[PDB]
Each structure stands twice: as structure tokens, then as C-alpha cells.
Amino acid sequence: SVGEDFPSEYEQWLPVPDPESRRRAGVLLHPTSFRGPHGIGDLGEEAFRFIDWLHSTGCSVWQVLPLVPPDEGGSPYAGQDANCGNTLLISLDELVKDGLLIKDELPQPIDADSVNYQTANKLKSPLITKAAKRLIDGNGELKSKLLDFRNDPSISCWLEDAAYFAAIDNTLNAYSWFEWPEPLKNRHLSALEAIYESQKEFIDLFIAKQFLFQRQWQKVREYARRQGVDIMGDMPIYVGYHSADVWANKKHFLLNKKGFPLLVSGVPPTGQLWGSPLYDWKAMESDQYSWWVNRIRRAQDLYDECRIDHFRGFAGFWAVPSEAKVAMVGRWKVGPGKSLFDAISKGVGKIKIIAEDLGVITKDVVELRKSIGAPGMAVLQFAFGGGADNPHLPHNHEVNQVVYSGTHDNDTIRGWWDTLDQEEKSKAMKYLSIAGEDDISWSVIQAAFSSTAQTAIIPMQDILGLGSSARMNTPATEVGNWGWRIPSSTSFDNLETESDRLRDLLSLYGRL
Amino acid sequence: SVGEDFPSEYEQWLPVPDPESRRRAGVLLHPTSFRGPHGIGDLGEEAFRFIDWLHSTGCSVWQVLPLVPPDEGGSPYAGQDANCGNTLLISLDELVKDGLLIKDELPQPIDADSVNYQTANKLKSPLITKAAKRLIDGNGELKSKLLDFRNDPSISCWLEDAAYFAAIDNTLNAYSWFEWPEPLKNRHLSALEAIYESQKEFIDLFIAKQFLFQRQWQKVREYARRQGVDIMGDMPIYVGYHSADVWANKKHFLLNKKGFPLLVSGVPPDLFSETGQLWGSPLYDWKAMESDQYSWWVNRIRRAQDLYDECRIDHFRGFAGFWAVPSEAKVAMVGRWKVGPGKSLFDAISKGVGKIKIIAEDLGVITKDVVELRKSIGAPGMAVLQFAFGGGADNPHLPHNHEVNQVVYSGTHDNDTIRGWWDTLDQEEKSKAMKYLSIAGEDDISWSVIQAAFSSTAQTAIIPMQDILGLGSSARMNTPATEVGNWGWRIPSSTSFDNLETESDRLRDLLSLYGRL
Ligand SMILES: OC[C@H]1O[C@H](O[C@H]2[C@H](O)[C@@H](O)[C@@H](O[C@H]3[C@H](O)[C@@H](O)[C@@H](O[C@H]4[C@H](O)[C@@H](O)[C@@H](O[C@H]5[C@H](O)[C@@H](O)[C@@H](O[C@H]6[C@H](O)[C@@H](O)[C@@H](O[C@H]7[C@H](O)[C@@H](O)[C@@H](O[C@H]8[C@H](O)[C@@H](O)[C@@H](O[C@H]9[C@H](O)[C@@H](O)[C@@H](O)O[C@@H]9CO)O[C@@H]8CO)O[C@@H]7CO)O[C@@H]6CO)O[C@@H]5CO)O[C@@H]4CO)O[C@@H]3CO)O[C@@H]2CO)[C@H](O)[C@@H](O)[C@@H]1O
Numbered sequence A: 001s002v003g004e005d006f007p008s009e010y011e012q013w014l015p016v017p018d019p020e021s022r023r024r025a026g027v028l029l030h031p032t033s034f035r036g037p038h039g040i041g042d043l044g045e046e047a048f049r050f051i052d053w054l055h056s057t058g059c060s061v062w063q064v065l066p067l068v069p070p071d072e073g074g075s076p077y078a079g080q081d082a083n084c085g086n087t088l089l090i091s092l093d094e095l096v097k098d099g100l101l102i103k104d105e106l107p108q109p110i111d112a113d114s115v116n117y118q119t120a121n122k123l124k125s126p127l128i129t130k131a132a133k134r135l136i137d138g139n140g141e142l143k144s145k146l147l148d149f150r151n152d153p154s155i156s157c158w159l160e161d162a163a164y165f166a167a168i169d170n171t172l173n174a175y176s177w178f179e180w181p182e183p184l185k186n187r188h189l190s191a192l193e194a195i196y197e198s199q200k201e202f203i204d205l206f207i208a209k210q211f212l213f214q215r216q217w218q219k220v221r222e223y224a225r226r227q228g229v230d231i232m233g234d235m236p237i238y239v240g241y242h243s244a245d246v247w248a249n250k251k252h253f254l255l256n257k258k259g260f261p262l263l264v265s266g267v268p269p270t271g272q273l274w275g276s277p278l279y280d281w282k283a284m285e286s287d288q289y290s291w292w293v294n295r296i297r298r299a300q301d302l303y304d305e306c307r308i309d310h311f312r313g314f315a316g317f318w319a320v321p322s323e324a325k326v327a328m329v330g331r332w333k334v335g336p337g338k339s340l341f342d343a344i345s346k347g348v349g350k351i352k353i354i355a356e357d358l359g360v361i362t363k364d365v366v367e368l369r370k371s372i373g374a375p376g377m378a379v380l381q382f383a384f385g386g387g388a389d390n391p392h393l394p395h396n397h398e399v400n401q402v403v404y405s406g407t408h409d410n411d412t413i414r415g416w417w418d419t420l421d422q423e424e425k426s427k428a429m430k431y432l433s434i435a436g437e438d439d440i441s442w443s444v445i446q447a448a449f450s451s452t453a454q455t456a457i458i459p460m461q462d463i464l465g466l467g468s469s470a471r472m473n474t475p476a477t478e479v480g481n482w483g484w485r486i487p488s489s490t491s492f493d494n495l496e497t498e499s500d501r502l503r504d505l506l507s508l509y510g511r512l
Numbered sequence B: 001s002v003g004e005d006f007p008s009e010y011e012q013w014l015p016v017p018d019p020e021s022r023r024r025a026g027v028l029l030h031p032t033s034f035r036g037p038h039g040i041g042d043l044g045e046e047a048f049r050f051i052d053w054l055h056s057t058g059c060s061v062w063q064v065l066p067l068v069p070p071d072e073g074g075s076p077y078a079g080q081d082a083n084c085g086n087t088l089l090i091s092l093d094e095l096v097k098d099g100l101l102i103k104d105e106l107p108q109p110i111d112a113d114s115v116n117y118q119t120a121n122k123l124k125s126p127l128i129t130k131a132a133k134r135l136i137d138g139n140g141e142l143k144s145k146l147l148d149f150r151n152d153p154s155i156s157c158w159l160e161d162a163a164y165f166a167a168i169d170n171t172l173n174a175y176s177w178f179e180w181p182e183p184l185k186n187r188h189l190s191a192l193e194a195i196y197e198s199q200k201e202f203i204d205l206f207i208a209k210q211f212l213f214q215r216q217w218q219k220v221r222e223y224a225r226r227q228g229v230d231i232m233g234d235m236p237i238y239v240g241y242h243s244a245d246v247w248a249n250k251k252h253f254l255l256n257k258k259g260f261p262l263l264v265s266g267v268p269p270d271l272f273s274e275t276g277q278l279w280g281s282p283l284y285d286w287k288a289m290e291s292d293q294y295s296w297w298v299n300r301i302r303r304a305q306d307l308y309d310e311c312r313i314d315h316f317r318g319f320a321g322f323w324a325v326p327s328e329a330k331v332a333m334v335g336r337w338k339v340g341p342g343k344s345l346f347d348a349i350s351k352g353v354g355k356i357k358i359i360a361e362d363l364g365v366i367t368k369d370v371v372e373l374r375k376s377i378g379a380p381g382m383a384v385l386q387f388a389f390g391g392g393a394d395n396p397h398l399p400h401n402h403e404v405n406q407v408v409y410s411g412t413h414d415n416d417t418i419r420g421w422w423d424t425l426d427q428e429e430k431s432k433a434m435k436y437l438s439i440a441g442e443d444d445i446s447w448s449v450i451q452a453a454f455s456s457t458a459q460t461a462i463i464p465m466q467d468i469l470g471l472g473s474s475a476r477m478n479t480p481a482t483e484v485g486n487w488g489w490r491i492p493s494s495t496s497f498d499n500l501e502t503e504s505d506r507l508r509d510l511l512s513l514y515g516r517l
């Protein structure tokens, strides 16, 4: 009532910081990059030591690339399945702790300054198989947990299809499932029954290996939670054609009557022809988008938060005739928009998505992102072309946003600086606080941390001040990517200086 | 619909910047500070030269302090009236252009490094009176404009009361209107009639002088608009007791039956103040104001719209909740918090006046209701960089904590200059500032802070002229709670707007870099 006395509590009725608005920082590091003797990083001791080091710095987020089974080139983005984990991340030493291997069975260490997948597979897979076999042949607590995992409806809704798909793909010599004999191609019940009988061992071992992955990943996730670290995963909007995701869900994709894609993914200008099948969004509507709901439920199972690559495809997507050799001959199609996210909310509750929204995007993309409250991205490596309206410049950043120095698709800051255009360089020198070129990565890190963006993420390569040899991926190249590992001599114990320097900057910019 | 082709225009359907979100910068400079021969700055040629210089820098806002008639110490915040203009800002040269003075009547120039009000009044007021007399005695276009001004209902709703109040205050030897004889104190109709008869000349001259102020100020404002410069004024939430604002609107204030205030304004002791502050202004009877749809405040805002593009309101928190001290108290601690009018006030203003552009002065420990009210009306608050380096990294004045809908200052008229502030800064705050700011020579510390203001996400950055000129503590405009030596700063006599090209270039370069052009 106007003019009357307030209660005496008035003076303590102060604004409270919303815990959901807490400023934070983190590190982008894929677990393949961890040090160790078995040819690849894994979910063992180095994952826990990394989490400890991250906690020591004051960082509270760890971002990974997709954890799916990669292709032969190591790519997390050409996954063999959208929901399975990369079994080569399984730690042999952790299997010893679980009693499925004995210490004596572990292999002699190998030099692998970079990940060679074929070498890691040859070394580790026989032992992961032996552990899985011991698991299925036993009858204890661990076997009982395997059964709970296998019979859990939110696991079984993708795992059985994944395991049958893999067993068929293992048994058949064929390019893709389009070439499979009709009863297998089209999942006839008695054909699938016959596959279970004839490939029973393969199927049970595949499922056990997914269990072992789940168990180890979940231990890592819990450990991160215990040390005040959230994990942010990565989910590409599209899935590959030759996958259980498509084969077991044909009606949910734009395929012809023979199961061949009608239209494929890409972006216009030469633009890019990615060549993935496209979702049949109208068909998906008819079962309240169950396929996407299930995918998000799996993402929730693995990660605290998730980046979706090419988030713009939910508003509008480029569709290329499947017979085309290039992208420029396609059409833009209307995406599902907020009705998809409404269905997800109804199905799964609150989600934490990060929209990858880089490049030329349309007004509908921005409106959709805002309507669901998702942050977009700023990337400082992109800030110094054009004028002062570039959205990647700090003064243009938004609070509900994730700022990066760069992503896995960019060179390291040092490498980027090396090849940078003179006009962009002179510009960067005005915006950034730069001392020696040796320390350019720390200039950019400081600019990221000084941002109003609620979350700042730095690649481990930039914290280590590494050059172009440490770049994780060069887009559109098909060899020499995804192999970077933390140098063999750099232990998390050897990074106290870097931790102190990070912590000092987080303190200064209110991210602790 | 889903899955179908978009039109072929799709790829050009790009996000458009909202023109209302445009980043900008500006300068805080009160017109008394302009150079010139008559003891005080004025609304003549220096105001136009300043606008031209400001335009050249890329700035698009000019902020002033209240333009009201100040007290004898020069304070714009102890105004004699809430709506009148300070007639000492009237340019004598502009009166010559209007044919109301001849060049020969102008006084010999005086050296006045700082504004002395008594000196300016003695020099200028007789000539402003002579001009006003010539105006009222004439017939012609200018006389016709005077009549239009006087008979305009949105002028007359405050000007007639102001003019009668001033005529009585002139005629009577009394401390305040509380001491006036009852028929004058209480505005008896036949007493007011008698005053118009006996003080007709005074009243007509007062009104003419307000006309001359309005004419000159409106020319400055129109010139600014032509050069792409918005003017931001300043309106203190409360008004003084000895004013037409109170005397002519007694039922709108918390007064007793004798017209003495029941409760007066202040703030209580704080995290940052052991004793609070007793300001001692009368308080609004907000309940009574609600009953006529806040007509007094609607009229005040209409006058603010007439003078300014946008307006800062000092102690905006008083609209949500206000501290009320028994008027007999010698100490602020004795009061209590009362419920303010909240958004119903702003709704009434919107109905009465349309869209307004207010800036909320919201500094210090404020309550959740203040923040919610400010946000509900879309008003920006303030950040002041001089306050940013105490406490930890959650300090709201630090750039990383700035908001878009906000006005960032290096400092205000109540703060020292940046150079002066730096000189006396606490070693712990200084070390902190040295980490956050980009500093070259310490002589150029004001430019470090300017850069930090411009680099902010805050939509508007405002810099005192003293900081552009890199001046020290001698150029501080006001020291709060002191009663002598304030409000006097003038631009050094040597420094002309024709010789600030380097400063203009430097500002423009920073505005370009930070997207404020
Ligand atoms: O003419 C005859 C006449 O002459 C004289 O009168 C004249 C005056 O002398 C003259 O100056 C002039 O006055 C006028 C002014 O010019 C004009 O500007 C106007 O001024 C008004 C304001 O309008 C009004 O709002 C008010 O302002 C007051 C405040 O009410 C008061 O509280 C106080 O605030 C200041 C602080 O004290 C000061 O410390 C600082 O605060 C900073 C702080 O330092 C900084 O750290 C930061 O703080 C954060 C903090 O970092 C963050 O962590 C958090 O804290 C939380 C904790 O962490 C938690 O643990 C938990 O506790 O919660 C807290 C809180 O959430 O949040 C903190 C807050 O954000 O930021 C702070 C700032 O935000 O600055 C404060 C603001 O200045 O002091 C101000 C200033 O005084 O009053 C002034 C007037 O005093 O109007 C004036 C006219 O009325 O003209 C006069 C008339 O001529 C004579 O005096 C007179 O007697 C003669 O008759």
C-alpha cells in the first residue's frame, strides 16, 4: 500500500545473485588426448587427474567432442552410431580394478605421441573383449548390473538395435545396409531372430562392452560432479546413413521406398555437401518426435549440458538431391522449430543445450534459440575481420553465450596468429592486451575471460601454448586429424604455473 | 509448413540491428562551465561550438546537470524552482541578435577562472532585465511568441505559480514561505489578485525572462538535434520546501496543518555509511497524488520532455521505497522506510505524456523492489568505473558485470576527476585497477578509464569534460557535503573547441573500435 510503512525486514530485502547465472570457465579436451601407455587416452587415472587439475584452476566445465565410435580416421563426427560410446576409451587399468583383467595381462606400453587408431585397436581390443567375456560368464554383482543396464527401457531403446546392426555389419561383407539382403535390410523378425542365434556371442559382447563404457564414463562424470565440474558433450544434429539410427528408424528419415536417401545434408555457398540423410520432420511429429526425445535422454545420461552442431537446422535446413556431386544445387526447407523442443520438454523435462550458431544465420534461427533460452557461441579467432559490429568482438558478446578462443575445427591461437592477415593482426593488437608473440594464446584467453559471456571455454592446446602441430582438426581434410595428445612429458603435476595463471584470471574476472 | 521449401529469399533473411539498441557515447558538461567574458558560461556561441566539437568526436549525447535556478552557492541540486531555467545562462550576445540589447550596452569583460555567482548576477542581471522590459514593451513577432509561450497551458501550469511565488519572495523579507502572512502563505485568492496588481511589473518580467531562457535553450536543443546530438537532463526526485512547487501544491506533500513538513527525506545508515544522510526535503504524499492520477509528476515530466531528449532521475529508488525522517530529528537514523508509488506512477506518466526516456540513478545498496521497478519500465541504471575496484570481482561497476541497458560513467559531477581519483586511490584498489585497465602513461590515466567505459557492453558511455581534458582535482565539480567552493569549474580560458582536434581524433578512434559511432 502506497505511502504506508514497509515491514522492518525491508533493508535486508537485497538482490540475490541467481545461481543459474554464475560466471564460469572451462577447458575443451577430448579424452583420446590424455597421456598413457596404450596408444590412446582413456577413462582411467588421467581422466581423474585432469579433473583434479581443472578443479585446482577454478574451472567448472569440461567440454568433450562426441563420445561415439569414430570412423577409421578417428573422427568423432562420422560416428558409427549416435548413442554408443567409443569402446577404445575404456581403461584397461580400471578393468583390473573391477576384477575383469589381471595386472599381468596388461600390454607392454607403446610410444604413441599421437593417436593411431589401428595401433590402439590392435593393442586394446583383445583385452576389452576378454574382460567383456569374463563379465558375461560370471554371476555376481557386476553381472547383475549388466542385466539391469540391458533391460532398462531407456537403454534398450537404442542398444538392441545398435548391437544387431553391428552383428550384421560384422557378418556381412557389404558397403552399407542399402546392399543387405531384403530380410536384413528391412529387419524382418525371423531374420533378426536368426541373427541372434548365429551371432549370439558377438551381440552379448557388444552389449557388455557398452556396459563397460557406461560404467567407466559414469564414474568419470560422478568424479567431475564431486570436484564441482560440469561436463558438456557434443551432439551433431545429423546422423550417418550407415548406422542403426537410420536402419532401425527408416520412417523417421527422408528415404525412398528402397531405403535410399531422397535428399542429403549440406550448406549452400561452393558450400559443403555433407551427404547425411535428412529427418522426415512431418513423420516425426506423428509420434511426438520420439526418436529425438530418446536421443536427448541419452545425452542427459552422458552429459550435464550438450552443444548441438548446426543448431540452425532445427529452424531451416539445406537439402541437396542425393544424386548430386555438389552442394550449390539444393533448396532450403522448413525445420520443426519450437514444437520439437516442446516435445522434448514434455518427454524429458529441463535440458541444457548450447546452440552452435556460427556463420551466416537467418532471423528464424536467432528467434528459435532465444525462445528456448539456449546460449549461442562467440569465437575470438573470428572477431578481427570486418568492422566493429562483428559479433565475436567482446563488446558485442551477450551474457547467455559461450565464448571460445577457438574450437577443435580451428588452429591453436599460436598457429592462427602465425598465419593471420596483417589487417586483422593490427586490429587484434588494438583490442587485445598483447605482450610477446610466444604468449599470444594467453592474450586471447584473457579476452575470453574478461567477456560478459557467462561461460568461457579454452582448448587445452591454448593453455599449453602449442602451435599448429597440435591443431585437432582441419576441416575438409581426410587424413591426419583427431590425433593430438598431451605431450608425454607434460603431466598435470607439471602445470602448476599454468593453473596459477588461469586461477588469477578467473579471480580477476569473477569466474571462480 | 515443416519440411516444405522456403521462399527463395531465405538466405537474405538476416537479423537486423534494432535502432533502439544503438551503442553511443557522450560528454557530461554543464553550460555554466563554458568560456566567456560575463563571469559564467551561457547558451550562446560556446554552446554551439561545443555541439560542433562533440559531433566531430562521434559522440551523440550531451548530459547536463539540472538547469534550474541554483542556490547562492551555485548548486543545481538546491534549485529555487523545479521547472524554471537559470536565467544567468541567458546569453547577452543572443539578446543583441534579437534586438533587445545593443552592443554598446554590453559590459566590459571580466576575468573569471571560476564561476562566482554573485559576480555574474551583478554583471548580467540588470541587462537581462532591460532586455525583458524591451520585450514586454514591444509589439512584433518576438512579443507574439512571448504571448504564445505564456498562454500555452503546459507552460502556464507551472509558470504562473513560479512567477507569483518569486514576486512574493522578492517583496517579503522572510526566511521561507512558512513565515509568510497567512493570506500569502495559504494562497488566498484575493491576496493573489492583490499581488498581481502590486507586483505586476515583477511578474511580467519574470515570465519574460523564462521566455528568453526557453527561446535560447530551444535553439541550443534544435541545433544539437540537427548535429545528431541528444541532450540528457537531470531531475532530482525531490524538490525543496521553499519553492512554488511545494507552496502552490501543498496537498501533494506530507505537511501538517501549519504547512510544516511532517517527514523529510534522507537515507539510513548503510554498509558504506555509519550515519546515513539527512537531506531534509519535504516528501510527496503519494496517496494524495494517486487520487488525481499523479498530475504534479505528469506535469514535471512534460516539462522535462520540453527541455531534454532523456532525463536522469536522481535517487530513483525513492519511487519503490523511501526513507522518511520525523522533521524534528537532527539525525537520519530516526526514520523508517515507506512504500513508494511503483509502476502505477509510470503508467500514469505514459498515459499522460507517451513514451519517456529515463535513466535511473540506482547507485549504492538498493533493494530487490528497486531493481524490479527499474526493469519493469525498461529504464537503464548506472555503472561508475571509479567505484569498480573495491571489494572483489562481483562489484557491479566492473566492466565484466555491466549490462547492455545501462549507462556507464568514468565518474559523475560528485566524484573527483579520474586523474584526481587516481592520485588518492587506495593501494589495494590501485593494484587491482592496474590489472583490469590498459594503462600507458599515468598522466593519461583518464584515457585508460575512458577506454574501459567505451569497451563496455553498456549501451551508453558518458565522460565528464574534465576527463577528456585530463584535468586534476582542482577541476572537480562538487565535493558532497561541503557547502563552499563547488559548482564553479569552467573550461580553462585558453582551451578552445578549435584546439581540441587531437582529443577529438582520439575519442573518434576509440568510438570506432568499440562500435559506438
Ligand atoms: O546547497 C546547500 C546544501 O549544500 C550541500 O548539499 C549539496 C550536496 O553537498 C551536493 O553534493 C549536492 O547533492 C546532490 C548530488 O550532487 C546529486 O548527485 C544527488 O545525490 C544524491 C543521490 O541522488 C542519492 O541516490 C543519494 O546517494 C547516496 C546513497 O544514498 C548513499 O547510500 C551513499 O551511497 C554511496 C556509498 O556510500 C559509497 O560507498 C559508494 O558505493 C559503492 C561501493 O563503494 C562499491 O563497492 C559498490 O558496492 C557494491 C559491492 O561491491 C557489492 O559487493 C554489493 O554489496 C553487497 C555485499 O557484497 C553483501 O555482503 C550484502 O551486504 O549486500 C551488499 C549490497 O547488495 O553491492 C554494492 C552496491 O552495489 O558500489 C557502490 C555504488 O553502487 O557509492 C554510493 C553511491 O554514491 O552515498 C550516496 C552519495 O551521497 O544521495 C545523494 C546525495 O547525498 O542529489 C544530491 C541532492 O540531494 O547538492 C546538495 C544540495 O545543494 C549540503 O550538504 C547541504 O546541507 C546544504 O543545505
Ligand SMILES: OC[C@H]1O[C@H](O[C@H]2[C@H](O)[C@@H](O)[C@@H](O[C@H]3[C@H](O)[C@@H](O)[C@@H](O[C@H]4[C@H](O)[C@@H](O)[C@@H](O[C@H]5[C@H](O)[C@@H](O)[C@@H](O[C@H]6[C@H](O)[C@@H](O)[C@@H](O[C@H]7[C@H](O)[C@@H](O)[C@@H](O[C@H]8[C@H](O)[C@@H](O)[C@@H](O)O[C@@H]8CO)O[C@@H]7CO)O[C@@H]6CO)O[C@@H]5CO)O[C@@H]4CO)O[C@@H]3CO)O[C@@H]2CO)[C@H](O)[C@@H](O)[C@@H]1O
Residues within 6 Å of the ligand: A071, A073, A075, A076, A077, A078, A236, A267, A272, A274, A309, A310, A311, A356, A357, A358, A359, A360, A361, A382, A383, A385, A386, A387, A389, A390, A391, A392, A409, A473, A474, A475, A476, A477, A478
Ligand atoms: O570422416 C570422413 C569425412 O571426413 C571429412 O569430414 C569431416 C570434416 O572434415 C571435419 O571437419 C568434421 O566436421 C564436423 C566439424 O568438426 C563439426 O564442428 C561440425 O561442423 C559443422 C558445423 O556444425 C555446421 O554449422 C557447418 O558450419 C559451417 C557453416 O555452415 C558455413 O557457413 C561456414 O561458416 C564459416 C564461414 O565460412 C567463415 O568465414 C567464418 O565466418 C565468420 C567470419 O569470419 C566473421 O567475419 C564473422 O562474420 C560476421 C560479420 O562480422 C558480421 O558483420 C555479420 O555479417 O555477421 C557475420 C556472420 O556472423 O563471423 C563468422 C562466424 O560467425 O566461420 C563460419 C563458421 O565456421 O563453415 C562452417 C564450418 O565448417 O558445417 C560444419 C562442417 O563444415 O560438424 C562437421 C560435420 O560433421 O567431421 C567430418 C566428418 O568426419 C570430409 O570432409 C568428408 O568428405 C569425409 O567423408
